[PDB]
Amino acid sequence: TYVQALFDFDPQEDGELGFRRGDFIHVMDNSDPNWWKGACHGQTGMFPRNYVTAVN
């Protein structure tokens, strides 16, 4: 399950996943409707659902 970043996300709190617009993120736990958890650049962390889009 993959998504792609719609915007840069600059993390502010421990647990927040940093990424740039266009990056692909591997979704690991999307149980929360608001904040998904996944992996990018060799880290796990959480980020808002609405900062990404699902991809194929």
Binding site: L6, F7, Q12, D32, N34, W35, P48, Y51
Partner: peptide
């Protein structure tokens, strides 16, 4: 085009 507001009170670690 603008990034959405980030809603940290909704974070699942809270």
């Amino acid at each position: 085009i603008q990034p959405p507001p980030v809603n940290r009170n909704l974070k699942p670690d809270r």
